[PDB]
Design a protein around this ligand. Sequence first.
Ligand code: NA
Ligand code: NA
Length: 860
Amino acid sequence: EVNVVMTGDMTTRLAFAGEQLKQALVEKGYEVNQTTGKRSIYLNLLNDTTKKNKERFDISTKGKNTYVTGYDGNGIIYGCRELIDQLDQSGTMDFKPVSDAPEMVLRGACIGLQKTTYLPGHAVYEYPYTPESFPWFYDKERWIKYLDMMVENRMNSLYLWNGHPFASLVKLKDYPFALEVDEETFKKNEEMFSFLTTEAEKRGIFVIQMFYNIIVSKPFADHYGIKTQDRNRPITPLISDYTRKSVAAFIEKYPNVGLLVCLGEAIGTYEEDVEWFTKTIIPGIKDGLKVLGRTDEPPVLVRAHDTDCKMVIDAALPLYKNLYTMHKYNGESLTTYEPRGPWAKIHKDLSSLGSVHISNVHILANLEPWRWSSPDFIQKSVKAMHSVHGANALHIYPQANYWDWPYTADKLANGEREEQVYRDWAWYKAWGRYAWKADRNRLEEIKYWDKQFGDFYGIPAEMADNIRIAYEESGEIAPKLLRRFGITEGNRQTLLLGMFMSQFVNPYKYTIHYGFYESCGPGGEKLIEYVEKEWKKQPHVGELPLDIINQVIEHGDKAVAAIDKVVSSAKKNSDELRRLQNDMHCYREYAYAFYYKVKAAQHVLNYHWGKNMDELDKAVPLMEESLKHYTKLVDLTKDTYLFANSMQTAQRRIPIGGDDGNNKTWSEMLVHYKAELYNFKENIEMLKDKKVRKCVEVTPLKEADVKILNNLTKVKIEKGAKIFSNIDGGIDAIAKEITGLTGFVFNGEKQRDDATTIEFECSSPVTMLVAYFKDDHRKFAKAPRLESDASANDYGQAEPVLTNALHVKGVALADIYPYKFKAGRHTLILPKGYCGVLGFTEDKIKERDVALDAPDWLFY
Ligand code: NA
Ligand code: NA
């Protein structure tokens, strides 16, 4: 019936290609003969490294013989995948000749050895590889399925993300106490890495271990009496020695595993980033290479995240020639296929290096947790990666629920968990398909996807087009709403839980970073900008917020109308199609809730500009209508989803704090949005009746009784006070709240070199007040930023308490951030650069813009 003949370099990839083709043919009812005149397929593997024929194959046919030429091991695998895809798309062994190669050179996905919350005993990102934490990591069948799916999608790279993996994977003779796992687990970890590298290698998959810096093991830390990580802590010879030896041990022991380096998030300055990479990491890699007898420099991947790419690559290239770069596609979200602005320039500059620049589709904060997999949106995004960013490689996150691998957020009957590889098959398949080839005729793609959805649900392709419509209409909702109304593309925000009125009418209170609105889609106006231009009779430019809410309710209505027609048809995976229908109804109720809230926010902003109280009367029924839609969203999610956000800690700030896993469900959020309307109505009632509103009674904070342990110079905080010993000017404006506190005097120069360490004890909870200056000069310590520093809320400091609150003559204006402590003995290192420590109080601090009457006072 069918002969399969393998010819050439008898490699593991050639042998895998052959087994795959044989299984595919017997699953179609053919008898297969294997060896190394009736129907024959010839698998020919050549030898050439010609970076040009990488992963290339040719298929030709002559009579009843088919010839597959693979230019390398990956080429012969992909040649066999093309025969199998032909056998699937028609039933016949009549093969079409094809010469093909992928457009992007690395095409891959990540799994996080990460959890929804911190491991008891450990800081952020820290999780030893153990079966207690990750039993799925030790499941060989689950690994085979994952790697088989990667081959089907022609993905050639797998990334494991972990804080400090080395202490689970290597033993150091100078630091034997560093090991974070018991001996039996250490043996299981060695066994799994051996299984994973072997299974991946025969499939043409490069395994890459990602790590954060600077992080040391819990037992190494405990032995030396230091912290596992501290962002502002200097580099020390001890921590450098431990990391260099760890990295060298890893290269020696797992010689085919790549490294993805994050120069963060526990490194305080760009100068320390360069020093760590060039003097600790790169020498550790060369140590391991020297030990193996390697003369080549295998690629090292470096994230642009939380560093200065240009300093880093410029300093590193003389020391190590083979560096790949990685940078987020749309920050930690998916917002646009028309990216632009300063962030597009950073991608273009990294692509300029003429090497491999990897587009990272990172975290997908704005899509969590509902189904998302728009072929159109994904195709257009890969076209943008090429045309706007210059990227030639792709790294994708899971579609949702990254922190909770291997499960989705779906709540099934009786505690059952849904697998991400099951639910999100079309996400992986779409990113793989467009990474292979971006330019594909859209009508032919619709027919391809109609058959994929039809086959999965057992529905004719024509009928299944309504599934494709549902994905492509609903797919535009979260991207559009985030880029037009969002606070951030970071997972600091969970878009699909909604937003407060305050976040619509006073968005800059919640800290919007330069770059987001300027990069993450077409140029346009915020709601506050649109309403200001209405009142000032100024022309409108670009994407308008009222246009976007109209578009999103239309997307919502069309997705529901499409999925409702087909949901009853499914002959397979019927429960899954009912969940997709439920997700489309969720997206529609979300879209209408958002529409009415934006309309309400426009009237509240009309009140701000005109002070016509009839504007507040119109806001109420729109808010009520928004709440009717949000109540329906609760009814749709309360039995169907465990939660929205997979990151379930105090690093989540928008719409409200996610501290200790609170505020992660629509049910929880509805309580807040009901209280927001109730409050609004009470405030309007008081305005009508009494023409009064609540405002802050401004009083000095009482100084707390604190003992300073590290010999700081004290100063009374008042007009005239010199908080910088190295400059001539004193405080020349100050919030009354701060006057009379006892702060400190520092040398701004010493602050640039050494950072600022405060050590103190308190017999009750205190807040320490820190001044960060509103000046872009690198001499100033930077205010806490959760998007580039997971530790930026460890003291409750992520948000300022008093804005525009301090001025020092010859310096700048400052905002005041709260650092909160329980009773105890404390040591804090603040970021390098000029900053002020103004004192301590046990008092409740009332938030205030000292420069003022913002339009959101009505929701307090
Ligand atoms: Na850094
Ligand atoms: Na990145």
